[PDB]
Paper text:
Dali homology searching had previously located a similar secondary structure within the Ebolavirus genus NP, two of the three alpha helices being identified as forming a dorsal “V”-like shelf and a much smaller, shallower basin, well upstream of the C-terminus. Here, we characterize a trio of semisynthetic anti-Ebolavirus sdAb previously selected on live virus preparations and known to recognize the C-terminal region of NP to define the determinants of cross-reactivity and specificity. X-ray diffraction was then used to solve crystal structures of sdAb–antigen complexes and unbound sdAbs. In our present study, we show the consequences of this FR interfacing in recontouring the sdAb surface to be more accommodating to undulating and convex antigenic landscapes, bypassing the need for a concave epitope.
We coexpressed the His6 tag–deficient sdAb with KIHis6-tagged NP C-termini in the E. coli periplasm to form antibody–antigen complexes in vivo and also used periplasmic expression to produce the His6-tagged sdAb alone to obtain the unbound forms of the antibodies. The noticeable shifts in the elution profiles for the sdAb–SB–NP complexes were rationalized by analytical SEC, where we purified individual components separately (these sdAbs were all His6 tagged), combined in the 1:1 M ratio or left individually for 1 h, and then injected into the column. The lower EC50 of the sdAb ZC can be rationalized by the minimal restructuring evident between bound and unbound interface residues.
Author numbering: 2 to 123
């Protein structure tokens, strides 16, 4: 597999998360990494993109709530998401444009008061 996504989970309204998309390919082939959000039965909706030389492209609705960054040298891009609301519950996908174009397998984010319920774990 080319892309490994993680950093998702369940968080209460108001919280933040930082999704990660790690590519197994070479850092020199990186051209851009875009992020998309797909709410339950909704269409995949583009959120933003980071380019190799570091420019940051954000969709009109984002208005500063989400931050795209790249690890120094772990060939990984991050999407930090703040002030989460139940409406942000979705599967978040990264897409890499390098030597070839690849989709990630998605990361589920759930924003709910039930994120404060941990008895299944402990």
């Amino acid at each position: 597999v080319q892309l490994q996504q993680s950093g998702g989970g369940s968080v209460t309204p108001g919280g933040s998360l930082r999704l990660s998309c790690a590519a197994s390919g070479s850092i020199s082939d990186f051209a851009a990494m875009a992020w998309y959000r797909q709410a339950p039965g909704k269409e995949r909706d583009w959120v933003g993109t980071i380019f190799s030389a570091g420019a940051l492209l954000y969709a009109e609705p984002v208005k500063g709530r989400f931050t795209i960054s790249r690890d120094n040298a772990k060939n990984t891009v991050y999407l930090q998401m703040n002030s989460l609301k139940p409406e942000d519950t979705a599967v978040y996908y990264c897409r890499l444009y390098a030597e070839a174009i690849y989709w990630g397998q998605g990361t589920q984010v759930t924003v709910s008061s039930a994120a404060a319920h941990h008895h299944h774990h402990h």
